Amino acid sequence: PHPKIVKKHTKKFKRHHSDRYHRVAENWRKQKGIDSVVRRRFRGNISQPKIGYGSNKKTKFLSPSGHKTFLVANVKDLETLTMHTKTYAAEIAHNISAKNRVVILARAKALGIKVTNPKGRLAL
Amino acid sequence: NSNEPPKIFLTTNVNAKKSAYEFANILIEILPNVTFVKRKFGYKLKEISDICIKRNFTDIVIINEDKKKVTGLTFIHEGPTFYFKLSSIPELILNNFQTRLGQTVGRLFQSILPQNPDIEGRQVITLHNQRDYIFFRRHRYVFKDNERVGLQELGPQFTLKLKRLQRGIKEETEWEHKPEMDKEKKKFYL
Amino acid sequence: SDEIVWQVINQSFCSHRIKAPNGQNFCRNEYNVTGLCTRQSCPLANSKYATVKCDNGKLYLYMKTPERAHTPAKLWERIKLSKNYTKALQQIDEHLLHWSKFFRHKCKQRFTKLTQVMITERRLALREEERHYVGVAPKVKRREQNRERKALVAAKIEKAIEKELMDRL
Amino acid sequence: NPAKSASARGSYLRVSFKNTRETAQAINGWELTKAQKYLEQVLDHQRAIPFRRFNSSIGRTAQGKEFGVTKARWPAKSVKFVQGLLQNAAANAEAKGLDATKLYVSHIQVNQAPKESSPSHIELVVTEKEEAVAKA
Amino acid sequence: MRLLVSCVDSGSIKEVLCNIGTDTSVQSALQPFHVAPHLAEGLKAYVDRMWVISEDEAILARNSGVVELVKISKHLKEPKFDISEFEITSSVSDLFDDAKLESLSSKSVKRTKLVDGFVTLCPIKKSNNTFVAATKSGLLHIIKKGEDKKLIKLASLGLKAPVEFLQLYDLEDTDTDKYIFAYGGEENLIKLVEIDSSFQSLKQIWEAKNVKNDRLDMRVPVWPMALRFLEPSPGKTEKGKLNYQFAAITRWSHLTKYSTQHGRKPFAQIDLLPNREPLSQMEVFDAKGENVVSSLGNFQSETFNELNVITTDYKKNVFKFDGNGRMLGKVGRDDITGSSTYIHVHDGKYLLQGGLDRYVRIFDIKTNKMLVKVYVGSRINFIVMLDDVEIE
RNA sequence: CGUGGAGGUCAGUGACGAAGCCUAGACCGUAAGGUCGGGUCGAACGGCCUCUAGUGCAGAUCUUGGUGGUAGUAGC
RNA sequence: GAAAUUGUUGAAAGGGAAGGGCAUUUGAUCAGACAUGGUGUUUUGUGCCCUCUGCUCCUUGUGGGUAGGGGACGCAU
């Protein structure tokens, strides 16, 4: 197995005053106003991003179920994962058709790789 | 047929999460002598067929689930097997089945639902056929003194659509619905 | 000489390399062990190398050396390998002799994995005849929904019921 | 339920959005012919039609005692158009074969149009209320 | 035309009468003259197979386990044409055994129980009254029709059961007297058996053995569906070995080309289709509508490359292949809606068709156009082309 | 990190649905951003290695367009 | 076919405010494996296993590829 996966901070950072205005969006950006409250970090305001939140190099990039993620298109591509079924799990880039997915599926169970997003575009 | 009561065997998908068991519990009303193993595990369908025949199961109903909504119903009677798929003792009605292919499914739902047909229905199960779509829902049957019979709609509700009809258990397909078969528009089958 | 061919492969690109979202970057070459193009697994800069690979038959150990380096059409030698996992492993660490530890350690593994793969694929060949996957094109959807809606709309569905009941009376 | 229902639509009317709005809202849920009765009674200066929204310059008036409001008005233009809508909705209804004794207005809507007037788009679906909706 | 078609619903035999170009799918096209049921004995007794040596004489194989015999004569109708009346002169009854089958119904993958029925009915020889009638269960009823006008049972013989298909090798001549059958079935390798006109003696002279294990080091299944002989192979005729050539279709879509002089393995086993598509029956046609075949169907020429075959699935499709397997193409692709039960090349220039769809169809080989389509309103398993007729 | 075009390369993906837009779905990044699941849609488009720019928005009594409150108001 | 902005239906709170931060609560709501084996032990067929008999290409080596007659290590049971 793996260590226990700890995010250190699980809440997406929002841009100051994002909600009070639409002409402002939700993608974090800095505050350069030297008067501003969010820049000088007054109590009770939003939390900047800062390096200390950087996660644990051991479990970094790990999806929760414990694997990592690797993004495949055709079967010839997932054959690179014959070795690592214990670390990487592979999922199927969105534009793949419903014709080839089912192929990546069957062959991806034979190899015994975990596909994070099966059930995409496939009924029974 | 009109000899022994239909003694049926309902089933489900392999894993078959909640919704399946739900709709199962909505089936138990419209049929009877209905049991179901409630758990199915890996076997080969030959086995299930045999063990059913020894137990005097005339016919088996297979529910199919997409883990979310029920999709498709296979009816297997030693004889033909139907694959429908669906989108949401009493009396019975059918409509607009007139055809060979139609009267096949007619013979189905006239065999299955009535439970060696019974009577006194103040609530009726209505199967109507519009183009390439079998529907049924269940009303309750109330005369209004002049002519027209008022009804309550007491549910449930959903349409079927026939897709497979094939001769043995699995044996050969005697009809299909292609994707293209509706390239042509006015056909209407049954 | 080889270290250069590496460094070229480590700055310019290989035709084949992947760069997964985390920092590490696969090597999709058909012939390599471990599938990560790094100094010691990238078959293009080694000049001495050995892997295991399925033919659709059993698992041929492919080997190369410096001497056929210039004669690619035939460079990889090839060996078959037994169906005795034990005897196999003995064949593998047999042919590899003073080939360094890397290739015995790893080649053995690739054998183990591909064997297991075979065994699985053999199981799955025998299973679940039922419920194949199927796709449904989008306009298939749209068509079905609408045509259904119109189907119901066309059937006023009580007029049938009542008229059938006046019938039964 | 569409199976038992009838739809009337209107569009590109030239009215006031606000007046048409309310005078649409007032009848939501009413039986058919009592509705026509209403619109009739309200076009002749009997029982005016309450405005819960736009209350500036609206004189206190007694008859609004039915609805909980002292404010109402006798708009001319609006109840004409919606009146007709109820007409043709009744036509669509009858040729459908529906039942005018069950028939009431299940849905009514108005919403703005291009442009400076304030034209409108109206939607109403009457339906025949059925006794005994659902078991279970 | 005048044709016969076995009606599975009532267990009868319809006769169909009409021109080239017929369709019932529309009021426009020209219409069938006549369709008739005859001698409808019930779902048990529906006709398993049918053979007509000469126009008046047609032998019934009847699923009740009963062989009958049919005298045919034309008479006035009710333009102008004639029809016939069909009444049974001779019979020999209860020729089956179910229970021996039923004991193996567990091993097969098929359905529930296994009915006994006739998997072959035909003449021997090509000038002879003899008939070799085969059962699922292995029982071989060999019955020559005595000149007494009556059918008489010559022998009942054993096979290694069940027996799916059986074939007589006539390509040599009528004379040499010592008859070769090849038969096969469930997990049952192809087997060459021989029989004398003493008709009590069958020795198994040859038996195939399966191809080597497949890609997965698993074992390819064994299910030969159908077999058609060729000439012996030219070249140096070799020590100890029968000289024959023949080719067989498996459920598993394997085309299998056997040459004894080579040995016991098939030298070519080639899957025609992706992933184990189940097939059925067979026909050997030729490109030009030509007649290349014996009267029981064995293709005549000594090289496979000159072979072309028609094979069906269990769903709709009907295919045309070469000796190599490269598909020539579908037939009735845009038409057939259902399992195509029966296909017989006729005169090399015609194609019989019929099945669960309930349209009897007739297609042309080289043009690949549907000539004739008739709605009998029944599942029909079998078709025979009677006299091609004028229309008055 | 992202945007527009270019030179390679994935024998990349794509009418079995590319882009795009919606999303009270999920995961990943500390963040810039990224990647998948549904939904609508119809024909092109993306990842790695490098080049080149008309390349990143909340503001400018900013420009152009669309909308509102003001209000069915003052009023005709 | 986006946003602003508006209508309808439903949710929810409100009577003196909305918005944000840390945390749970309650409601709704959604996701939640084609996991279904492994290690052996025995019975028994088949064949890439055994024993005969070949054939072939070349990097001629602790190599591939392939056929036929038979018999009892992988596979199935």
Swiss-Prot record, chain A:
| Sequence positions bearing Phosphoserine | 36
Name the PANTHER family for this protein: 60S RIBOSOMAL PROTEIN L32 AND DNA-DIRECTED RNA POLYMERASE II, SUBUNIT N, RIBOSOMAL PROTEIN L32
Alphabetized CDD domains for the sequence? Ribosomal_L32_L32e
Task: Give the superkingdom in one word.
Answer: Eukaryota
Annotated GO biological process: cytoplasmic translation
Keyword entries, A-Z: Cytoplasm, Phosphoprotein, Ribonucleoprotein, Ribosomal protein
Identify the gene encoding this protein.
Answer: RPL32
What job does the chain carry out?
A: Component of the ribosome, a large ribonucleoprotein complex responsible for the synthesis of proteins in the cell. The small ribosomal subunit (SSU) binds messenger RNAs (mRNAs) and translates the encoded message by selecting cognate aminoacyl-transfer RNA (tRNA) molecules. The large subunit (LSU) contains the ribosomal catalytic site termed the peptidyl transferase center (PTC), which catalyzes the formation of peptide bonds, thereby polymerizing the amino acids delivered by tRNAs into a polypeptide chain.
Q: SMART domains this protein is in?
A: Ribosomal_L32e
Q: Which organism's genome codes for this protein?
A: Saccharomyces cerevisiae (strain ATCC 204508 / S288c) (Baker's yeast)
What is the protein's given name? Large ribosomal subunit protein eL32
Q: Per the record's keyword annotation, is Ribonucleoprotein included, yes or no?
A: yes
> What Gene Ontology terms describe what this protein does at the molecular function level?
structural constituent of ribosome
- Could you say which protein family the record assigns here? Belongs to the eukaryotic ribosomal protein eL32 family.
Q: Where in the cell is it found?
A: Cytoplasm
From Swiss-Prot, chain B:
Q: What is its main location?
A: nucleus
Any keyword Chloroplast?
A: no
Q: Where found, per UniProt?
A: Nucleus, Nucleolus
- Which keywords label this protein? Nucleus, Ribosome biogenesis, RNA-binding, rRNA processing, rRNA-binding
One GO cellular component assignment for this chain's record is: preribosome, large subunit precursor
Per the database record, which ranges form the Brix domain? Answer: 6-171
What GO MF terms are annotated? rRNA primary transcript binding
Note whether Methyltransferase occurs among the keywords.
no
Q: Where is this region: RNA-binding?
A: 149-166
Domain of life here?
A: Eukaryota
A Gene Ontology annotation in the biological process aspect, one of them, is:
ribosomal large subunit export from nucleus
Q: What does the function comment of this entry state? A: Essential protein. Required for biogenesis of the 60S ribosomal subunit.
Q: What else is known?
A: Present with 784 molecules/cell in log phase SD medium.
Q: How does it assemble?
A: Part of a complex that includes BRX1, RPF1, RPF2 and SSF1 or SSF2.
- Tell me the protein's name: Ribosome production factor 1
Q: Which organism is it from?
A: Saccharomyces cerevisiae (strain ATCC 204508 / S288c) (Baker's yeast)
Q: Which gene encodes it?
A: RPF1
Curated annotation (Swiss-Prot), chain D:
Under the subunit heading, UniProt states: Component of the large ribosomal subunit (LSU). Mature yeast ribosomes consist of a small (40S) and a large (60S) subunit. The 40S small subunit contains 1 molecule of ribosomal RNA (18S rRNA) and 33 different proteins (encoded by 57 genes). The large 60S subunit contains 3 rRNA molecules (25S, 5.8S and 5S rRNA) and 46 different proteins (encoded by 81 genes). uL22 is associated with the polypeptide exit tunnel.
Q: What is this protein called?
A: Large ribosomal subunit protein uL22A
Which residues of the intact protein are shown? 10 to 160 of 184
Cell compartments where the protein resides: Cytoplasm
Q: Which GO terms describe its cellular component?
A: cytoplasm; cytosol; cytosolic large ribosomal subunit; preribosome, large subunit precursor
Concerning its family, UniProt says: Belongs to the universal ribosomal protein uL22 family.
Q: Which UniProt keywords apply?
A: Cytoplasm, Isopeptide bond, Phosphoprotein, Ribonucleoprotein, Ribosomal protein, Ubl conjugation
* UniProt KW rRNA-binding keyword: no
Q: Does the keyword Zinc-finger apply?
A: no
Q: Where is this cross-link: Glycyl lysine isopeptide (Lys-Gly) (interchain with G-Cter in ubiquitin)?
A: 37
What else the UniProt entry mentions is: There are 2 genes for uL22 in yeast.
Q: Which organism is it from?
A: Saccharomyces cerevisiae (strain ATCC 204508 / S288c)
Any Gene Ontology biological process: cleavage in ITS2 between 5.8S rRNA and LSU-rRNA of tricistronic rRNA transcript (SSU-rRNA, 5.8S rRNA, LSU-rRNA)
Modified residue Phosphothreonine is at which positions? 61
Q: Which GO terms describe its molecular function?
A: structural constituent of ribosome
Report the superkingdom from the record. Eukaryota
Swiss-Prot record, chain E:
Organism (species): Saccharomyces cerevisiae (strain ATCC 204508 / S288c)
Q: Which GO terms describe its cellular component?
A: nucleolus; nucleus; preribosome, large subunit precursor
Self-association and partners: Component of the pre-66S ribosomal particle. Interacts with NOP7, RRP1 and RRP5.
Q: Where in the cell is it found?
A: Nucleus, Nucleolus
> What's the gene?
NSA1
Protein family per UniProt: Belongs to the NSA1 family.
What is one Gene Ontology biological process annotated in the Swiss-Prot or TrEMBL record? rRNA processing
State the UniProt keywords alphabetically. Nucleus, Ribosome biogenesis, rRNA processing
Q: Which InterPro entries match?
A: WD40_repeat_dom_sf (IPR036322), WDR74/Nsa1 (IPR037379)
Q: What is this protein called?
A: Ribosome biogenesis protein NSA1
